[PDB]
Every structure is written in C-alpha cells, then in structure tokens.
C-alpha cells in the first residue's frame, strides 16, 4: 500500500491550478503506477478561502501525512511544487522528518532550483516557452520571493542567462534583481519589446496584477513608458512540459536515493 503525496504552496484560482498544480499532480501520479495520488497544500490562507467558499477542504502536509498513516500506507513518496529549494521547502523537510516513524518509508524530492544541473536544465525548459524573438526582443521572466535562498536563485539565473547570452532576463517582483535596473538595462541595450513571463508555478495574483495588468505599477505597464512594448504571457511553469519533467525527474531521484 504506496502513496504518492504533491505538495504545492497552493492557489485559490481554480482554473491556473487546474493547469499548473493538477498538471504536474498528473504527471507524477502516472510516473508511480503503484501509488495513490493525494494532495497537500502549504498555505494556510489558501486552504481557508478554499473552505469558507468552496467546501473544499485541502490538508496541510501534516494532516496529510496522519491521514495517509491512519489509512494504512506504509510507503510515502513525496515531491514538493517549489521552485526555490528555501524556507517554504525546509519547513516540509522538519514535517516529515518528525512523522517518519509512522511510516516504514517516507521519501521527499527537492524543489527545481537544488543543483547546478537543475538551474541548466531549467534554463532549457525555459526556452521551450519562449516566443520566437527579433534580436532587440527579450523575453522577461518575473520570480517571487524575498528570502536569501529565492533572491539570490533570481539573481544566479540572470547571471547564468547573460553570460550565455540567453535571450531572456530575470527579476523578481519586490525582491532583487530588481525590475527598474532591468528595465534601465534593457533600455540601453536597444531592447525593443519584451515578453513578460511568470517564473512561478502557477498564474495567481503576482502575475496578473503586479507583471502583466493595465495599472501603472504593473511590469508591463512600466516596461511601456519606457517605450519597450511588453506583451504578457499569463501562463504558470506547470503549463510547461519540460518544467513538469523536472519535477518528475526530482521525484525519482528521491526513490532512487
């Protein structure tokens, strides 16, 4: 009796978690044929606002854990929907280090950003989503996150882009690098238009309000009156079969281990 445990941070936006969370639910359910597939959201605020207006009720990774012992699972894989390998994901290393006697195996993969091959192989994911582009063309990507593990992930991403030449930039909505530099950078440059893209899971509210909405403060917004056109692309990374292949990939190497 095996299960299969998806931890996300969570969204109350049914339809981008249909495409992002349920996606890669999806895909590593079908990787692990003998497993049950549940779910586990982290966010506390998000479990709430599904529960007063849905009824739906989403366990934490503790109570699903409990609830997986009480049915009987005996062997637990679990993979977490993060991007950055920081705090949210070291919290659910504790959780499950504390219930693991429950259990006779609890096994928990790491978020996409934990190796230097991950950022390479994320950086190949990426340029899957990427629309064809003129050579004054950059597509930008919009990460979140303030922590030290999640900044300095952004910044060694935009590192790595620049130095290969990648065609894309990366910033991080009230965080670093920081998108006015960006914008200041790309403006020299001669860039011409851009391609705003989340660098998050799913599309929630960062996404639509703060990178691609029509108020003056949005990304696009700013990315314009500097006058370099910036087109949006609503769509989270789980929309991205490479980026779902990533977590797949991450999954099995926790089995493996």
């Known amino acids: 009796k095996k299960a299969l445990l998806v931890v996300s941070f969570g969204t109350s936006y049914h339809d981008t978690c249909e495409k992002n969370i349920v996606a890669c639910e999806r895909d590593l359910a079908a990787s692990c044929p003998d497993r049950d597939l549940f779910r586990a959201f982290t966010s506390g605020m998000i479990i709430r606002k599904l529960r007063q207006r849905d009824g739906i009720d989403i366990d934490t990774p503790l109570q699903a854990l409990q609830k997986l012992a009480a049915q009987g699972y005996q062997d637990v894989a679990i993979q977490s929907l993060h991007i950055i390998n920081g705090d949210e994901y070291e919290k659910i290393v504790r959780e499950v280090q504390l219930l693991r006697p429950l259990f ?54 935009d590192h790595m882009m620049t130095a290969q030449r990648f065609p894309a930039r990366v910033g991080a909505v009230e965080s670093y690098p920081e998108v006015d530099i960006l914008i200041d950078s790309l403006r020299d440059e001669g860039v011409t238009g851009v391609h705003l893209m989340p660098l998050m899971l799913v599309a929630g509210d960062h996404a639509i309000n703060d990178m691609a909405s029509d108020d003056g403060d949005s990304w696009k917004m700013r990315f314009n009156a500097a006058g370099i056109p910036a087109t949006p692309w609503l769509s989270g990374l789980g929309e991205n079969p490479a980026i779902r292949a990533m977590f797949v990939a991450h999954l099995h190497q926790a089995l493996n281990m």
């Open 104 to 157: 006779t195996r609890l096994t928990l993969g790491v978020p996409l950003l934990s190796s230097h091959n991950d950022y390479v192989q994320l950086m190949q994911a990426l340029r899957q989503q990427m629309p064809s582009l003129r050579q004054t063309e950059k597509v930008v990507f919009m990460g979140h996150g303030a922590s030290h593990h999640a900044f300095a992930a952004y910044a060694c991403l």
